[PDB]
């Protein structure tokens, strides 16, 4: 029975919920399991980055988030072809590669190319044969000063270009923003019916001739 004044609250407890109860008493006993296997992994991959292969720079969909930048899954084969890295050898120097990604823009394609250059320049390569160096391989002076990098590799940080204070012109003060918004919204909500009404104005006013 409801009291005087309160909420109409619907509790979702009409199923046998006591059987399927999930308690988190092993959360501290699994955080240590994850950390232990994360340092067994950071010891299995000795000089390779501890976070893993480098990820590209990636905008987000969904206008809620389409101004932040993120770390994608891999570098599209287009960006690998521009950077000059075979798609089957990229995965062996810790470069991430997913083929599913497209590249519609260019401002991001060149950003990820510059990213591959900034990684293939920071890359210290060890020679396949230890007792014998090779051609494309960092020299032993690097290899002795080559450490294991912690955290993400080349971390991605949202930056904003600092624009200094200008002086406002009378063309900036002439710009009616709210009117321009309501006008573009009208000219877009009405574009189809306007074009059809003018196709009718041009399909009727021709009959008068023939």
């Amino acid at each position: 029975a409801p009291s005087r004044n309160g909420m109409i609250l619907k509790p979702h407890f009409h199923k046998d919920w006591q059987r399927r109860v999930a308690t988190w008493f092993n959360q501290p006993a699994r955080k240590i399991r994850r950390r232990k296997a994360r340092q067994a992994r950071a010891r299995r991959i000795a000089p390779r980055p501890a976070a893993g292969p480098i990820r590209p720079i990636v905008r987000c969909p969904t206008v809620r988030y389409h101004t932040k930048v993120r770390a994608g899954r891999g570098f599209s084969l287009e960006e690998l072809r521009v950077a000059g890295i075979h798609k089957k050898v990229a995965r062996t120097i810790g470069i991430s590669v997913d083929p599913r990604r497209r590249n519609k823009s260019t401002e991001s394609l060149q950003a990820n190319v510059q990213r591959l250059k900034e990684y293939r320049s920071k890359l210290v390569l060890f020679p396949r044969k230890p007792s014998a160096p090779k051609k494309g391989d960092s020299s032993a002076e690097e290899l002795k000063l080559a450490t294991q990098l912690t955290g993400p590799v080349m971390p991605i940080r949202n930056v904003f270009k600092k624009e200094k204070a200008r002086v406002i012109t009378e063309e900036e003060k002439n710009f009616k923003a709210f009117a321009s918004l309501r006008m573009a919204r009208a000219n877009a909500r009405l574009f189809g019916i306007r074009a059809k009404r003018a196709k009718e104005a041009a399909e009727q006013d021709v009959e008068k001739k023939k």
Binding site: V21, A22, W24
Partner: protein, 202 residues
Amino acid sequence: GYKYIQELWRKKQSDVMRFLLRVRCWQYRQLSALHRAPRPTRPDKARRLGYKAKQGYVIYRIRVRRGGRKRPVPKGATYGKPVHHGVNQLKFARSLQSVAEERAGRHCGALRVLNSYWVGEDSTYKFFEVILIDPFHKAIRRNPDTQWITKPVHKHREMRGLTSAGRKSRGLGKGHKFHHTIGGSRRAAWRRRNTLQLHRYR
């Protein structure tokens, strides 16, 4: 060549293929319900479904009676609320092809089911052919392209609904149509949606 038998087996409404499918269906209707075939009836569809013409690969032909699943209850009398008074027009949730693959995977329990296909039907029967693999031959043990099937994880793929015809019945997949099977399966989705996560600190 194989694409000629392929584009031919799509004109099932033609004359030649309605003569062949009908003499096949008549001959099948006279043999046993589950009998071993000497060789794959459709060699092209068999390759497409994974049949290498080498030792160890077996083809069983099996027929199943068409129609829905009458409810196994007394005369009428399904004691319950009028919602569940249905007996006649009910349907089974597993395809007749999965029932063929599991009557083969049960009649011959040593062999591992790979896939199956349709070779004929009539008003009272549907005829399938199941591609069974012998997982202890050496043509399959040593060949590393197919030694996955010999591990104990793939026991009774069709009793666990992992063949193609079975997977087609569990409504799994990626998309906005397959939301009720996010996670392992329908019951592993149901469990996580109907499971109350009670953290330590709430």
